[PDB]
Amino acid sequence: SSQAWQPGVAMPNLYKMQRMLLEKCDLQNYGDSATLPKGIMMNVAKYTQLCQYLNTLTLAVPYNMRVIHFGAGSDKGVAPGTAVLRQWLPTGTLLVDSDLNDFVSDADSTLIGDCATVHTANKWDLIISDMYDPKTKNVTKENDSKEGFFTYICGFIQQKLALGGSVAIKITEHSWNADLYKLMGHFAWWTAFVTNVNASSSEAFLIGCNYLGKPREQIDGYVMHANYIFWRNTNPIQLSSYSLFDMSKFPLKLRGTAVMSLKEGQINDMILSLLSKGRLIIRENNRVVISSDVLVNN
Amino acid sequence: AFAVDAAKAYKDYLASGGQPITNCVKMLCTHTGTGQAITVTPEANMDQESFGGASCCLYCRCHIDHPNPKGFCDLKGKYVQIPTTCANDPVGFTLKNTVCTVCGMWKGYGCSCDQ
Numbered sequence: 001s002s003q004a005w006q007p008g009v010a011m012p013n014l015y016k017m018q019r020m021l022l023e024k025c026d027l028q029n030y031g032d033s034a035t036l037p038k039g040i041m042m043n044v045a046k047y048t049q050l051c052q053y054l055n056t057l058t059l060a061v062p063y064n065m066r067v068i069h070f071g072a073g074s075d076k077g078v079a080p081g082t083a084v085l086r087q088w089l090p091t092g093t094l095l096v097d098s099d100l101n102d103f104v105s106d107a108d109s110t111l112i113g114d115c116a117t118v119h120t121a122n123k124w125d126l127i128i129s130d131m132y133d134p135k136t137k138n139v140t141k142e143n144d145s146k147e148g149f150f151t152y153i154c155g156f157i158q159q160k161l162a163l164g165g166s167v168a169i170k171i172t173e174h175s176w177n178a179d180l181y182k183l184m185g186h187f188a189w190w191t192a193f194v195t196n197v198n199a200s201s202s203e204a205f206l207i208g209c210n211y212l213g214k215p216r217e218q219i220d221g222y223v224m225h226a227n228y229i230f231w232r233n234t235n236p237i238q239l240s241s242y243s244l245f246d247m248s249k250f251p252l253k254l255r256g257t258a259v260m261s262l263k264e265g266q267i268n269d270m271i272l273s274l275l276s277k278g279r280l281i282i283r284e285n286n287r288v289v290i291s292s293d294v295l296v297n298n
Numbered sequence: 299a300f301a302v303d304a305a306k307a308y309k310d311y312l313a314s315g316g317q318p319i320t321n322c323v324k325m326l327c328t329h330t331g332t333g334q335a336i337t338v339t340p341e342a343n344m345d346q347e348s349f350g351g352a353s354c355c356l357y358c359r360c361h362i363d364h365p366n367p368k369g370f371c372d373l374k375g376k377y378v379q380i381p382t383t384c385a386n387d388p389v390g391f392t393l394k395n396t397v398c399t400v401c402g403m404w405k406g407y408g409c410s411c412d413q
């Protein structure tokens with residue numbers, strides 16, 4: 001494991017091509033723990049490693065980039081992941097976050113409520129989600145595709161992700177959704193990324209890199225989640241904090257990626273290829289407006 | 299005329315021997331930065347830690363109004379550099395200290411202007 005100096009490990013392509021049956025996740029290093037730098041929270045370390053890995057992909061990075069972060073609160077009422085995202089993203093990037101429970105944040109705007117209440121007028125260049133419901137960790141019931149916030153996330157990607165944009169959505173052994181895996185085939189590239197600091201967990205970030213707005217490949221999400229678990233079950237990942245100690249190249253590169261408005265009819269193969277290379281964002285460039293629906297009763 | 303004075307209350311709570319506010323969000327960084335007090339990205343030097351600003355603001359953390367007419371917060375959305383010797387209580391530090399309006403450093407913890 002020269003993997004130990006990486007920020008984490010991405011699911012190798014050959015595992016994506018299998019047709020495994022779903023098994024229980026049994027991680028060799030379950031209950032091992034990385035030694036974090038003095039005073040650093042797991043959530044800061046985890047998001048730092050996610051961003052270090054995203055630095056290796058062909059992300060579109062326009063001027064006035066727009067990023068939205070779901071599940072950004074903590075039981076301590078602060079937003080460590082948002083703080084890392086704001087560190088990583090170019091100065092001036094508009095960052096919105098949200099959580100079911102109240103918290104204070106460094107984001108430009110924060111919405112409190114169930115994610116299903118969140119609406120935005122504009123499209124986004126990057127969607128991050130850490131949402132997770134610990135009730136799903138029921139080892140005594142069958143492990144089926146979950147709905148809940150995953151239904152919202154799938155619709156939100158299809159309706160409010162700019163072509164060319166990317167996503168990183170947290171999943172676990174039991175917190176997953178088949179349509180979300182299916183949606184990964186609507187990106188130019190996808191993976192399941194495991195942070196080295198949290199490699200003792202079945203957590204991963206499902207990353208869709210450069211959205212194309214149509215199926216590039218047909219993915220059966222029940223099969224692919226089984227493939228993911230098979231990978232994790234047969235490839236122990238050594239816990240590691242090494243990458244946290246070198247932050248000299250951390251900030252996301254300002255690429256000034258072009259932003260254009262185009263109607264579905266003008267998305268030709270040449271456009272699709274620019275999207276695939278991280279060289280184009282398709283959306284409007286109007287004001288960013290958001291809201292949370294409030295249910296009124298007695 | 300009545301106003302809650304949270305700054306005073308926290309100072310008094312600390313002198314009473316109270317445990318400082320915890321869970322301020324400490325960032326990973328190079329620790330080769332400018333050392334200025336409040337910055338758009340982490341700027342800790344070798345003698346400092348950098349923290350997410352909102353998490354180090356007494357008013358943000360206590361869910362109370364900020365003490366100025368339009369309720370603006372100087373820390374939220376920024377990073378605050380705290381001397382490592384004081385990083386056990388970032389909120390107390392930011393409350394009790396002042397930023398030199400010329401050099402951007404903390405008075406008494408980096409400001410050279412009065413030499």
Ligand SMILES: Nc1ncnc2c1ncn2[C@@H]1O[C@H](CSCc2cc(/C=C/CO)cc(C(=O)O)c2)[C@@H](O)[C@H]1O
Pocket residue numbers: 070071072073074075098099100101113114115116130131132133134148149
């Ligand atoms: N539909 C929805 N809309 C909007 N935000 C939603 C949401 N669903 C969940 N979130 C939020 O996701 C964030 C990260 S989940 C962090 C977490 C919490 C617990 C709590 C245990 C209760 O004792 C356990 C673990 C663990 O790792 O075991 C992790 C939480 O801040 C949730 O509020």
Ligand SMILES: [Zn+2]
Pocket residue numbers: 352355356357358359364371372373374
């Ligand atoms: Zn504040």
Ligand SMILES: [Zn+2]
Pocket residue numbers: 398399400401402403409410411412
């Ligand atoms: Zn000065």
